[PDB]
C-alpha cells in the first residue's frame, strides 16, 4: 500500500479483528539515540498530542555523554494499534537524518527507506517472519527483539501479527527504573572497557614480574618449535 | 575456599569440631602417609602453569 502512516493505520484498524482492546500489563521500552535534540522534540511533541500521556512517556537520561542523548521510549498499556503508530513514527524518524534530509514531514515516510531497529519486552511473556528474538541478550531481565528491514505497511502488518500472539504478565510498578539503571550499567561497562585500550602493557598489569614469570617458557617453546622444524625436515627429506 | 570441605564458611567449624580426640597413640601411629592439608591462605601465584606440573588426563 501507500507510504502514508494514516492509510496503513486505518487499514490495520479495519481488518485486524479486535484491533482495539489492549494487552494486559503490557510494557515495551525502546531506547533510541539522536545527535540533535531540537529535531527530535518536534516529532515527539506531535507524537505526544495523538497518544495519551499515561500510555507513552519519554525518560531522558542524565546526559552523561553530553553529545548523544539517550532517550528511553516507554509504551505502557498500549493497544494493538498504538504500538504500530509509535513504532512506525519513531523507527522512521531516527533514520530520516541519514537518508532523506530534505523531505521533512514527520508522519509521511518516503519510499527509499526501510524500518530497522530494536525494542525490549519483559521476559515474563508467553508467545502462545519479520520480527525475531535474539540469542545472547545482554540486559539481565529483558528480551531484546529485532525488526529487520521492512516497508512501512509490512511493518504495521507484522507488528499486529506479533502483538496478537503475545501475552504479558505482572511486572512491578517501577520496572522502568530497573531498566534505566541496568542499561546504564551495561554501557558504562563497555565505555570503561574502551578506556583500558591504551593501558594494557604496564598500565595496570605489573609487567615487570609477568615477563620474568613467562620468559623461560616462551624460551623452551621456541626451542621446541625449532626442534619440530628440524624433525619435520628430516621426515620429509628423501635423502 | 570451596572444595577443601574444612575451610568452607558454612560447615567450616563443624569439620574441625567433630575431628574426634584420637586419645589413642597407635591410632595416629598406624598410618605413615602425608596429611596434605591445603590451607585457606593459598593464592593464584603458586602453580602458575598447570600443564608443566604433571597433570593427569580424565
Amino acid at each position: 500500500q501507500s507510504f502514508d502512516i494514516w492509510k496503513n493505520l486505518d487499514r490495520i484498524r479495519s481488518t485486524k479483528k479486535n484491533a482495539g482492546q489492549f494487552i494486559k500489563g503490557s510494557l515495551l521500552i525502546l531506547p533510541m539515540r539522536t545527535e540533535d535534540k531540537q529535531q527530535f522534540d518536534e516529532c515527539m511533541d506531535e507524537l505526544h498530542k495523538y497518544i495519551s500521556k499515561d500510555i507513552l512517556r519519554c525518560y531522558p537520561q542524565k546526559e552523561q555523554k553530553d553529545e548523544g542523548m539517550l532517550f528511553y521510549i516507554v509504551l505502557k498499556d498500549f493497544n494493538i494499534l498504538d504500538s504500530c503508530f509509535v513504532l512506525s513514527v519513531l523507527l522512521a524518524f531516527q533514520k530520516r537524518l541519514w537518508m532523506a534530509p530534505s523531505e521533512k514531514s514527520y508522519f509521511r515516510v518516503p519510499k527509499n527507506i526501510n524500518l530497522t531497529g530494536s525494542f525490549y519486552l519483559p521476559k515474563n511473556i508467553e508467545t502462545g517472519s519479520s520480527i525475531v528474538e535474539v540469542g545472547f541478550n545482554v540486559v539481565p531481565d529483558f528480551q531484546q527483539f529485532q525488526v529487520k528491514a521492512c516497508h512501512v505497511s509490512k511493518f504495521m502488518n507484522e507488528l499486529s501479527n506479533f502483538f496478537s500472539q503475545v501475552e504479558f504478565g505482572k511486572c512491578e510498578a517501577n520496572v522502568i527504573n530497573y531498566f534505566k539503571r541496568e542499561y546504564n550499567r551495561t554501557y558504562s561497562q563497555i565505555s570503561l572497557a574502551l578506556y583500558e585500550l591504551p593501558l594494557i602493557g604496564d598500565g595496570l598489569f605489573d609487567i615487570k614480574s609477568y615477563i620474568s614469570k613467562t620468559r623461560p617458557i616462551i624460551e623452551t617453546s621456541k626451542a621446541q618449535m625449532i626442534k619440530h622444524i628440524s624433525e619435520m625436515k628430516a621426515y620429509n627429506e628423501i635423502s | 575456599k570451596v572444595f577443601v570441605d574444612a575451610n568452607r564458611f558454612d560447615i567450616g567449624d563443624l569439620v574441625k569440631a567433630s575431628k574426634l580426640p584420637q586419645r589413642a597413640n597407635e591410632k595416629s601411629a598406624h598410618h605413615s602417609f602425608k596429611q596434605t592439608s591445603r590451607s585457606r591462605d593459598e593464592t593464584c601465584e603458586s602453580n602458575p602453569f598447570p600443564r608443566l606440573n604433571n597433570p593427569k588426563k580424565l
Binding site: - | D5, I11, L14, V15, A17, S18, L20
Partner: protein, 50 residues
C-alpha cells in the same frame, strides 16, 4: 547436610537423612506479644446490692 557432626560412619548416616524441610504456611492465631486472657474484668460490688 553434606558433612556430619555425627560419630557414625558416613554409611550409617546415610540412613538418618531427615525429611525435606517444612513448608511455611502463615499462622492463624494470636502472636506471642498479644496473647492474654481478658483484662477489664469488672468489679464485684455491683452484684451485692441488686
Amino acid at each position: 547436610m553434606n558433612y556430619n557432626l555425627s560419630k557414625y560412619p558416613d554409611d550409617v548416616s546415610r540412613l538418618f537423612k531427615p525429611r525435606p524441610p517444612l513448608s511455611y504456611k502463615r499462622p492463624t492465631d494470636y502472636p506471642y506479644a498479644k496473647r492474654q486472657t481478658n483484662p477489664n474484668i469488672t468489679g464485684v460490688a455491683n452484684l451485692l446490692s441488686t
